[PDB]
Amino acid sequence: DVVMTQTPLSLPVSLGDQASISCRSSQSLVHSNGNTYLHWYLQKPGQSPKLLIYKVSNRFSGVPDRFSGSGSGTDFTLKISRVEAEDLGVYFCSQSTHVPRTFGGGTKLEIKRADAAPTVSIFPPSSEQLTSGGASVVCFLNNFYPKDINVKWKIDGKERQNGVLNSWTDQNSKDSTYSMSSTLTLTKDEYERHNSYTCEATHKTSTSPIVKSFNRNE
Amino acid sequence: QVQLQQSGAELVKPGASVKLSCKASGYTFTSYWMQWVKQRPGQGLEWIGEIDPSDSYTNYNQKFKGKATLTVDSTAYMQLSSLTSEDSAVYYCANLRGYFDYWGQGTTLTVSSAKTTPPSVYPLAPGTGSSVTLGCLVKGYFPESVTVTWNSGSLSSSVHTFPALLQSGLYTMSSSVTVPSSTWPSQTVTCSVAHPASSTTVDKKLEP
Ligand SMILES: Nc1nc2c(ncn2[C@@H]2O[C@H](COP(=O)(O)OP(=O)(O)O)[C@@H](O)[C@H]2O)c(=O)[nH]1
Numbered sequence: 518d519v520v521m522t523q524t525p526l527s528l529p530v531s532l533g534d535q536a537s538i539s540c541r542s543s544q545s546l547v548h549s550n551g552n553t554y555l556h557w558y559l560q561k562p563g564q565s566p567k568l569l570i571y572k573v574s575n576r577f578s579g580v581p582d583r584f585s586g587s588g589s590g591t592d593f594t595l596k597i598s599r600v601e602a603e604d605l606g607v608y609f610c611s612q613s614t615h616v617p618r619t620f621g622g623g624t625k626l627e628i629k630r631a632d633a634a635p636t637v638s639i640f641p642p643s644s645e646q647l648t649s650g651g652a653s654v655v656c657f658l659n660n661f662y663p664k665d666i667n668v669k670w671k672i673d674g675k676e677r678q679n680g681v682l683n684s685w686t687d688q689n690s691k692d693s694t695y696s697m698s699s700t701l702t703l704t705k706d707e708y709e710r711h712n713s714y715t716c717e718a719t720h721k722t723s724t725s726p727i728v729k730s731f732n733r734n735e
Numbered sequence: 736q737v738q739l740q741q742s743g744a745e746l747v748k749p750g751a752s753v754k755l756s757c758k759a760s761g762y763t764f765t766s767y768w769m770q771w772v773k774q775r776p777g778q779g780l781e782w783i784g785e786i787d788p789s790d791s792y793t794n795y796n797q798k799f800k801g802k803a804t805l806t807v808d809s810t811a812y813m814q815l816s817s818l819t820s821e822d823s824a825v826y827y828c829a830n831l832r833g834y835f836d837y838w839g840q841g842t843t844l845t846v847s848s849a850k851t852t853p854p855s856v857y858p859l860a861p862g863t864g865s866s867v868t869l870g871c872l873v874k875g876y877f878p879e880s881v882t883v884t885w886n887s888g889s890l891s892s893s894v895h896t897f898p899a900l901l902q903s904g905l906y907t908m909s910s911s912v913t914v915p916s917s918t919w920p921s922q923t924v925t926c927s928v929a930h931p932a933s934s935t936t937v938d939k940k941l942e943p
C-alpha cells in the first residue's frame with residue numbers, strides 16, 4: 518500500500534489565476550517497465566470521479582490544455598493555468614504502478630470572489646404542517662460570500678438556541694456564492710402562543726444584522 | 736458511448752449480505768477488467784478489486800478479501816458480506832485503464848436496522864421585491880436520498896438544494912427556487928419530491 522499525500526487540503530483561488538496541487542507518494546511510482554502510473558481526477562459534488570490527466574501528463578478526451586501535469590518519482594504537480602468557476606470540486610491523485618491501487622486524500626478547490634450580501638427570506642409554518650401539530654419556521658439566506666455567517670432566531674424579541682437546524686450548500690459553480698437554510702422547529706402549541714418570529718443574520722457585508730420577521734397577522 | 740449502469744441505493748440490516756450490479760454497455764465488455772471502488776463522505780476513495788470478464792479471473796485488495804466476491808456476465812457483480820455501520824458508503828464499478836476510464840454512478844449502501852420511512856412535504860410560500868423565493872420542506876424520511884425538482888425540472892436556473900440533516904433519527908432537507916415576482920402566483924410552480932426507497936413521488940403546488 519503506497520500512501521499518496523496531497524497538498525494543500527483546500528485551495529482558495531480567484532477566477533483567472535493559476536493553481537497548483539501537489540502529490541507525494543511513499544515509494545517511487547516508476548514501474549519496472551519504464552512508465553509512471555500517476556493520474557489525476559476531479560469529482561464534482563454528487564458525481565463520480567472524472568479523469569483529467571493519466572500517466573503524469575497526458576490529457577483524457579476533451580480535457581483542455583489549461584490542465585497540465587508534471588512530476589517525477591515521488592513528487593507530482595497538477596496545474597491549472599487559469600481557473601474557471603467550473604473547476605471547483607475535489608482533486609485526487611491516484612497511482613496504479615503498485616498493487617493495491619491508491620488514491621490521495623483530495624484537495625478542495627475554493628473560488629475567491631467578491632463579497633456578496635445574502636438575500637434572506639422568511640417562511641411561516643404551512644397550514645398543512647400545523648394540522649399535524651408541528652410547526653417549523655424557515656429562513657433562507659441565499660447567494661452570499663464569504664461562507665462565514667451567523668443566524669439568530671428570536672421569538673417576541675427573545676433568542677431561541679434550541680431546535681434550530683442549519684444547512685449550507687457547496688459553493689455554487691454558477692456564481693461562486695453559498696446559501697444556507699436555518700429551520701426553527703416548535704410544537705403547534707408553542708407556535709400559537711407567540712406573535713413575531715425573527716431571523717437575524719450577521720455577515721461581514723453589513724454593519725447592522727440583516728433582519729427578517731413576520732408577525733402572525735398576515 | 737460506453738456506459739456503466741449501477742443501482743442507486745440499498746438499505747440493509749447489519750450482519751446481512753448484499754450484491755451490487757454493473758451493466759456494461761457501449762464497448763466490448765470482455766476487453767477491459769472491471770474495478771470496484773468504495774467512498775465514504777470523507778472523500779477518500781479505496782480500491783476493492785478487479786475481475787477479467789474474458790476468463791472471469793479475479794484480483795482483490797487484501798482489506799476486502801474477507802468482505803467481497805466478484806462475478807461476471809454484460810454484467811459484473813460484487814457481493815459484500817457481514818455488513819456493519821462502517822460498510823455504509825458509495826460503491827463504484829469502473830473501467831480504470833489509462834485513457835479508457837469510465838465510472839458507474841455508484842450505488843449508495845446504507846446499513847441500518849431502521850424502517851424505510853416516506854417523506855412529508857410542506858410548501859413554503861411567503862407570509863415584496865423584484866424576485867420571489869419559494870421553497871419546499873421535505874421532512875422525516877429514511878433513507879437517503881430524495882430528489883426535489885421544480886416544474887418537473889424545467890425550472891432549474893435558480894434552485895438551491897440544501898443537504899439533508901438527521902433530525903430525530905430521520906432526515907430533513909429543503910429546496911428553494913427564485914422566480915420573477917410577476918410570475919407567481921399568476922403562474923404556479925410545483926416542487927416534485929421523489930423518494931425511491933419508499934417508491935414515493937409527491938407533488939406540492941405553491942399557493943399564496
Ligand atoms: N502497473 C500497471 N501496468 C499497466 C497499467 N495499464 C497498463 N499497464 C501495463 O504496462 C504495460 C504497458 O502498457 P501501457 O502502460 O498501458 O501502455 P504503453 O506504456 O504506452 O505501452 C503493459 O504491461 C500493460 O498491461 C496500469 O495502470 N498499471
Ligand SMILES: [Zn+2]
Binds near residue numbers: 673712
Ligand atoms: Zn411571546
